[PDB]
Design a protein around this ligand. Structure first.
Ligand SMILES: *[C@@H]1O[C@H](CO)[C@@H](O[C@@H]2O[C@H](CO)[C@@H](O)[C@H](O)[C@H]2NC(C)=O)[C@H](O)[C@H]1NC(C)=O
Ligand SMILES: *[C@@H]1O[C@H](CO)[C@@H](O[C@@H]2O[C@H](CO)[C@@H](O)[C@H](O)[C@H]2NC(C)=O)[C@H](O)[C@H]1NC(C)=O
Ligand SMILES: *[C@@H]1O[C@H](CO)[C@@H](O[C@@H]2O[C@H](CO)[C@@H](O)[C@H](O)[C@H]2NC(C)=O)[C@H](O)[C@H]1NC(C)=O
Ligand SMILES: *[C@@H]1O[C@H](CO)[C@@H](O[C@@H]2O[C@H](CO)[C@@H](O)[C@H](O)[C@H]2NC(C)=O)[C@H](O)[C@H]1NC(C)=O
Ligand SMILES: *[C@@H]1O[C@H](CO)[C@@H](O[C@@H]2O[C@H](CO)[C@@H](O)[C@H](O)[C@H]2NC(C)=O)[C@H](O)[C@H]1NC(C)=O
Ligand SMILES: *[C@@H]1O[C@H](CO)[C@@H](O[C@@H]2O[C@H](CO)[C@@H](O)[C@H](O)[C@H]2NC(C)=O)[C@H](O)[C@H]1NC(C)=O
Ligand SMILES: *[C@@H]1O[C@H](CO)[C@@H](O)[C@H](O)[C@H]1NC(C)=O
Ligand SMILES: *[C@@H]1O[C@H](CO)[C@@H](O)[C@H](O)[C@H]1NC(C)=O
Ligand SMILES: *[C@@H]1O[C@H](CO)[C@@H](O)[C@H](O)[C@H]1NC(C)=O
Ligand SMILES: *[C@@H]1O[C@H](CO)[C@@H](O)[C@H](O)[C@H]1NC(C)=O
Ligand SMILES: *[C@@H]1O[C@H](CO)[C@@H](O)[C@H](O)[C@H]1NC(C)=O
Ligand SMILES: *[C@@H]1O[C@H](CO)[C@@H](O)[C@H](O)[C@H]1NC(C)=O
Ligand SMILES: *[C@@H]1O[C@H](CO)[C@@H](O)[C@H](O)[C@H]1NC(C)=O
Ligand SMILES: *[C@@H]1O[C@H](CO)[C@@H](O)[C@H](O)[C@H]1NC(C)=O
Lengths: 99, 370, 86, 36, 244, 49, 50, 34, 50
């Protein structure tokens, strides 16, 4: 009831997930080498023969960011699965019998 | 749809995600400021006298409505070259701080007027920034800026200690120490006057005559817009997913009477990552807030194609009040249900409780008896 | 990566089927989470109840057993845990 | 340390690791398992 | 119509601490309940501020000018490089009516001042004004602490201002107050030095209670906090301490 | 990736924040190493002789 | 045109760095599993009879 | 203070020995009493 | 002689055959340069960072 910071692991998990989502969202604001980070503007400012080039740059940047996010998620999921498996073993052994 | 998205002629019992749905918008709206007065472009182009390259003339233009069609369709301009924008789109953009720099150049150096270029006038008289946005206009002036005896009022600088920063003008007419011999205010040897005139005569052929050149420089979305094209505003409608164009800002969503308060000097507001949440209308000066119209994901529940063909459709995280992929078949009178996961169509809730087959979420799950 | 634009979708479709496996991985992750919780907690076949009268030789479990008064139907320690962490 | 690589030292020195191993071994020789 | 003087007034320039003053709204974008990090030209925290009890001072990048003013003795401002007819100059005056801003090639003499008659009718700051380019009129700008910030960036002259009720005797208050933008001017000059203007009581000049604080601006990165109402309440200077 | 070049740094600046998360991951594993060793070995409360 | 070559070098080096980081992450996970097993063995066999 | 981890300024080194609060490295760490 | 780089230069005892101009060790990093004029062997160390 009194002392806090006794639940560090769960808080760390939540913080990691939230920070990952935050950086993924914030990645949308980078030029990646193009002329603008907003797509409607460059659509509504120049002729398609080069709008295609600008969209190519945006597309490749955002693809890289998304792939990185997915890979990080996969690693974290594997680790959490290992922890949950250990927890299942502990509940089966210590709760349901004397160890 | 699930057969097509899964690439099989048979589907097993379970739940599959097929696609997403969005609310289509209607009744596009264009809203521009009321300021309407003809913008003074002709006098810049039709000016009788221009200035030398080392003293290029600059004019600042704001608070006007501009028609570039008269400039574009006219064939009098030999070179009409735009870099950051398309020439045909110039009638649909709103922006501030128009800059017009006019002068006259040698015919053969016209292609030194471009970002990332090297030349004589390119580094000593007029240098453009690499990221320059705008247009350049070049057109011959043999009949006017050339004299049979040869006019020499047009000067250019050939000697300088170093190059020029972008958008910079130098008018320092001082002797230059060309060689190791000091000048001390006297030319003598190894010292020459930096400026010299042009030998413009009508006798010379093409690529030698003087060319009148003017560059237009812009800014893109950095201030309350002051210069706009020839476009017509309209009325505004709220609480409907519509396309909107506020002062060159294009978007799609629903507009609502906002509650947040603006200090008398902002123009809009945002929270995280270029999410324009509030906007002030240019004419009525009334604050509004923008939120995109609803969208979501759609999934199906099927008991397996070997057993039956009936399906149920779940729209994830969408209020059941509004729902109608078209699929109006599941929008007329079919049974509807609302759960924390979203809205369910085609399945009926039963008070009986027992173990299920196809999980849905939040403790709700479905199965085949219907 | 397109923000509801047709030109972006047309340029994207020539990059192959990246997004199919991109969605597949996330779906696998979600199913794995559900399986994790199910296998950790659902260790029993029935739902037992404690008797109304509680005389466990002097041991006092009132701090751990669920409180019927609270609508949440959670015990004291569980409420403390739920309140402490966001 | 060539062009950005850096190697950080471990928090526990080898002497401390030796001390833990010695403590464990001297405990299990004399006390048995009761010290655990 | 300006003459010299014999009482060679010499202002006892002392030094004081800047504390945490001189923070303004950098852009025209509303933000609520958020911490935003921005890099711009600001007045660094805890710097020297010169106190004057009218020397020609250099402009540098920009100037923070403060006055614990009573009865509004200070009237105007002079900006330029040589303050003569050879180069363009900027002048600001704020009398009991609308302010006047001019950008002309004036001719400034040794002791420019307004002058008041006792019903005021007097204006002898300069001697000649031949070429004029820009003019401007708006509401008057001005016990009380008045703060102004002058910047010259991208051919734009930005003037920001704020007024606060204060009661401390001499030292600058230990508090926080953002500066709302006042006016932007789309005029390009290469100003490097500036001055100040006084409305001496011409009836023998009696202007001795002319105190003002001057500080200079440097480029650096700040962290700003916006509350729910969109008002800046706290700021942190990044390059001041390891804690920062 | 730049080797102390100003223009290289400027060009890299517009690629977002890859480097922040790279350094974050490396720091995470670096801390995990020490946590790992301390968990394995520090099983006693005193130092017997 | 130097900027184009600079960009090519930048993207190549960035990709290589990302690959290295991912390999490090995998190896660290494996080592962590091994060390957890080692800790269990030291607790169960050194401090008591198994 | 100069140590194997690096160069440390702003904190004073003592001859005592306590538990570890804020790990520094190479077998040393710091704490708040200065 | 066209090989550019930043570092601190010290004296070295390594021996070059009369036809080399500069050495390297592994991973292709320069470590020793023979100056064109005095024909002596120097040693390059990256100045400190951290
Ligand atoms: C400069 O002046 C001339 C004539 O004064 C303008 O020529 C106009 O050309 C258009 C298209 O051929 C005609 O429809 C107009 O009637 C012409 N003007 C007149 C007064 O007859 C020319 O457009 C002017 N330049 C600019 C940039 O406006
Ligand atoms: C879908 O929208 C309706 C209409 O607003 C919601 O019904 C209202 O719900 C609020 C609480 O959220 C009640 O206070 C109102 O009395 C309801 N009726 C109205 C406003 O007419 C409904 O809750 C929404 N569905 C979900 C899942 O939020
Ligand atoms: C188990 O412990 C709880 C906690 O003290 C006891 O609950 C208290 O009971 C006394 C007497 O009935 C009350 O005065 C307190 O207010 C109770 N505390 C709370 C937090 O409710 C409980 O009585 C104990 N179990 C038994 C069987 O006596
Ligand atoms: C305003 O500026 C113009 C432009 O410089 C001045 O006209 C010049 O005056 C000088 C003074 O001797 C002459 O040498 C130049 O030939 C003039 N013309 C130019 C183009 O420089 C003018 O004197 C200034 N003042 C007024 C009242 O017009
Ligand atoms: C933010 O704005 C709100 C809206 O005015 C302020 O709330 C008012 O505060 C005053 C002073 O305490 C009260 O007298 C009013 O009754 C409040 N309004 C309402 C509707 O209750 C608020 O003070 C401002 N500042 C902060 C920090 O919230
Ligand atoms: C290149 O370097 C200098 C340039 O003049 C010279 O080297 C010196 O030459 C004098 C003349 O014989 C000798 O006394 C010195 O001992 C030389 N110095 C060194 C450092 O060698 C010469 O022209 C050239 N030297 C060599 C070695 O190529
Ligand atoms: C445009 O017209 C409306 C209606 O007449 C008016 O209220 C508005 O003020 C006008 N625009 C400006 C900028 O004054
Ligand atoms: C469908 O189910 C029936 C009954 O289980 C079975 O006999 C039949 O083979 C199934 N057909 C297919 C295509 O799975
Ligand atoms: C149970 O059935 C009754 C029918 O009278 C209905 O009113 C009630 O809503 C049902 N309960 C649930 C949880 O749906
Ligand atoms: C002379 O100047 C000083 C310095 O400002 C001032 O205090 C004093 O009142 C002045 N005296 C007269 C007579 O003007
Ligand atoms: C700046 O502040 C310091 C600290 O009080 C002071 O000693 C110094 O005189 C002030 N002025 C200058 C020019 O350093
Ligand atoms: C002074 O006030 C008068 C009153 O109309 C008017 O000329 C103007 O507002 C002021 N003049 C100057 C030069 O500031
Ligand atoms: C101080 O300023 C406030 C508002 O800025 C004003 O209401 C008040 O009258 C001023 N006080 C004096 C003495 O001028
Ligand atoms: C710590 O002890 C050592 C040797 O006992 C001695 O050399 C050193 O000066 C001492 N330092 C302090 C701060 O006591």
């Amino acid at each position: 009831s009194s002392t806090a910071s006794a639940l560090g692991k769960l808080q760390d998990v939540v913080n990691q997930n939230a920070q990952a989502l935050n950086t993924l969202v914030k990645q949308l604001s980078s030029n990646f080498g193009a002329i603008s980070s907003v797509l409607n503007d460059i659509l509504s400012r120049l002729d398609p023969p080069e709008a295609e080039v600008q969209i190519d740059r945006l597309i490749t940047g955002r693809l890289q960011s998304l792939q990185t996010y997915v890979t990080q998620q996969l690693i974290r999921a594997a680790e959490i699965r290992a922890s949950a498996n250990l927890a299942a073993i502990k509940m089966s052994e210590c709760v349901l019998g004397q160890s | 749809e699930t057969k097509c998205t899964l690439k099989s002629f048979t589907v097993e019992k379970g739940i599959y995600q097929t696609s997403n749905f969005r609310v289509q918008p209607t009744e596009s709206i264009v809203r521009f400021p009321n300021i309407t007065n003809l913008c003074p472009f002709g006098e810049v182009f039709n000016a009788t006298r221009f200035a030398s390259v080392y003293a290029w003339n600059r004019k600042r233009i704001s608070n006007c409505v501009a028609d570039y069609s008269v400039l574009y369709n006219s064939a009098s301009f030999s070179t009409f070259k735009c870099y950051g924008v398309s020439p045909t789109k110039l009638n649909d953009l709103c922006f501030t701080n128009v800059y017009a720099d006019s002068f006259v150049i040698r015919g053969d150096e016209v292609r030194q007027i471009a970002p990332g270029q090297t030349g004589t006038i390119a580094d000593y008289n007029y240098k453009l920034p690499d990221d320059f946005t705008g247009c350049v206009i070049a057109w011959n002036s043999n009949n006017l800026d050339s004299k049979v005896g040869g006019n020499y009022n047009y000067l250019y600088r050939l000697f300088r200690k170093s190059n020029l920063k972008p958008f910079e003008r130098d008018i320092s007419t001082e002797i230059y120490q060309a060689g190791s011999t000091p000048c001390n205010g006297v030319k003598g040897f190894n010292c020459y006057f930096p400026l010299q005139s042009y030998g413009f005569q009508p006798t010379y052929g093409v690529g030698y005559q003087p060319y009148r050149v003017v560059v237009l420089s812009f800014e893109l979305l950095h201030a309350p817009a002051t210069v706009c094209g020839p476009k017509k505003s309209t009325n505004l409608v709220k609480n409907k997913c519509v396309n909107f164009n506020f002062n060159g800002l294009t978007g799609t969503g629903v507009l609502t009477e906002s509650n947040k308060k603006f200090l008398p000097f902002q123009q809009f507001g945002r929270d995280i990552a270029d999410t324009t949440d509030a906007v002030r209308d240019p004419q009525t000066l009334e604050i509004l807030d923008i939120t995109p119209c609803s969208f979501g994901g759609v999934s199906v529940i099927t008991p397996g194609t070997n057993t039956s063909n009936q399906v149920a459709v779940l729209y994830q995280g969408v209020n059941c009040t509004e729902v109608p992929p078209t699929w109006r078949v599941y929008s007329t009178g079919s049974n509807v249900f609302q759960t924390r996961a979203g809205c369910l169509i085609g399945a009926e809730y039963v008070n009986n409780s027992y173990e299920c087959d196809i999980p849905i979420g939040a403790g709700i799950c479905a199965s085949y008896q219907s | 990566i397109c923000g509801d634009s047709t030109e972006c979708s047309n340029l994207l479709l020539q990059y192959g089927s990246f997004c199919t496996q991109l969605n597949r991985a996330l779906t696998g992750i979600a199913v794995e989470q559900d399986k994790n919780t199910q296998e950790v907690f659902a260790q029993v076949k029935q739902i037992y109840k404690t008797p109304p009268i509680k005389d466990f030789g002097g041991f006092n479990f009132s701090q751990i057993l669920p409180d019927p008064s609270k609508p949440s139907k959670r015990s004291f320690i569980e409420d403390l845990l739920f309140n402490k962490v966001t | 340390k060539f062009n950005g690589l850096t190697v950080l030292p471990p928090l526990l020195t080898d002497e401390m690791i030796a001390q833990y191993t010695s403590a464990l071994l001297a405990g299990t020789i004399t006390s048995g398992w009761t010290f655990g | 119509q300006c003459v010299n003087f014999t009482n060679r007034t010499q202002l006892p320039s002392a030094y004081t601490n800047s504390f945490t003053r001189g923070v303004y709204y950098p852009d025209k974008v509303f933000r609520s309940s958020v911490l935003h990090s921005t890099q711009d030209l600001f007045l660094p925290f805890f710097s020297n501020v010169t106190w004057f009890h009218n020397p020609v001072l250099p402009f540098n990048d920009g100037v923070y000018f403060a006055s614990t003013e009573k009865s509004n003795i200070i009237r105007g401002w002079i900006f330029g490089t040589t303050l003569d007819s050879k180069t363009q100059s900027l002048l600001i005056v704020n009398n009991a009516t609308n302010v006047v801003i001019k950008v002309c090639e004036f001719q400034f003499c040794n002791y420019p001042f307004l002058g008041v008659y006792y019903m005021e009718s007097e204006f002898r700051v300069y001697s000649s004004a031949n070429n004029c380019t820009f003019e401007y009129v708006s509401q008057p700008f001005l016990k009380n602490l008045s703060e102004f910030v002058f910047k010259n960036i991208d051919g734009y002259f930005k003037i920001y201002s704020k007024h606060t009720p204060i009661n401390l005797v001499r030292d600058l208050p230990q508090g926080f107050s953002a500066l709302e933008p006042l006016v932007d001017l789309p005029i390009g000059i290469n100003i490097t030095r500036f001055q100040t203007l006084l409305a001496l009581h011409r009836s023998g000049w009696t202007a001795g209670a002319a105190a003002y604080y001057v500080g200079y601006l440097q480029p650096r990165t700040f962290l700003l906090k916006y509350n729910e109402n969109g008002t800046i309440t706290d700021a942190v200077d990044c390059a001041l301490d390891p804690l920062s």
